[PDB]
Amino acid sequence: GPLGSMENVGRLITPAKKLEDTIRLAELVIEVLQQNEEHHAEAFAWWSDLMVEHAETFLSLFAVDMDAALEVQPPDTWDSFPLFQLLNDFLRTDYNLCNGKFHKHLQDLFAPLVVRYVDLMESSIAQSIHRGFERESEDLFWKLDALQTFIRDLHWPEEEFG
């Protein structure tokens, strides 16, 4: 009868209830455990979205100090390249800020200033190799090495063909 179709090893436990019950409990453990992962993911995002917004904003307020220091610059003078190096070397290996609003502004603000320096040193090596056309190399090689060393240390974030 019902009581005997229920008795196992001296205890009244329908083995299809001790399973149907274990199921519903597993259902609840899973749901709590997932809800916990959702909470963690969602808080990560909130704090992230806000800290990136904060970073992009404080970089704007800094930009004005940078844009301003790059007009006090005598034209075709490039002791401002260490600034681009420091700033771009941080932003490019930064998941959050790479190609962000400030990064693109730092590229634009320096994109003419970089080409106006390579065109100026490529014209001073081209003239010096063309100096063998009028009648009457060690120092010249250094300027090739200088331009190559410079270009490699630029780690430019685009693909600049020309």
> Site residues (CB under 8 A) for a copy of itself?
8, 13, 15-16, 18-19, 21-23, 25-27, 29-30, 32-34, 36-37, 40, 43-44, 47-48, 51, 54-55, 58-59, 62, 65-66, 68-69, 72-74, 79-80, 82-83, 86-87, 90, 94, 96-97
- Residue 61 Cβ vs a copy of itself, minimum distance, rounded to whole Å: 9
CA nearest 111: which of 70, 65, 146? 70
Residue 148 binding partner per list K ion, a copy of itself, none, with a CB distance cut-off of 5 to 8 Å that depends on partner kind: none
Tell me how many helices (H) and strands (E) the chain has. 4, 2
Nearer to a copy of itself among residue 93 and residue 123 (C-beta): 93
Residue nearest to K ion (CB): 44
- Dihedral class, residue 13 (left if φ above 0, else alpha if ψ from -120 to 50, else beta): beta
Rounded Cα distance between 135 and 76, Å, is 32
Residue 60 binding partner per list K ion, a copy of itself, none, with a CB distance cut-off of 5 to 8 Å that depends on partner kind: none
Q: How far is CA 33 from CA 23, 43, 45, 161, in A?
A: 15, 16, 19, 52
- Residue 33 Cβ vs a copy of itself, minimum distance, rounded to whole Å: 5
- Residue 118 Cβ vs K ion, minimum distance, rounded to whole Å: 44
- Residue 38 Cβ vs K ion, minimum distance, rounded to whole Å: 13
Rounded Cα distance between 96 and 59, Å, is 13
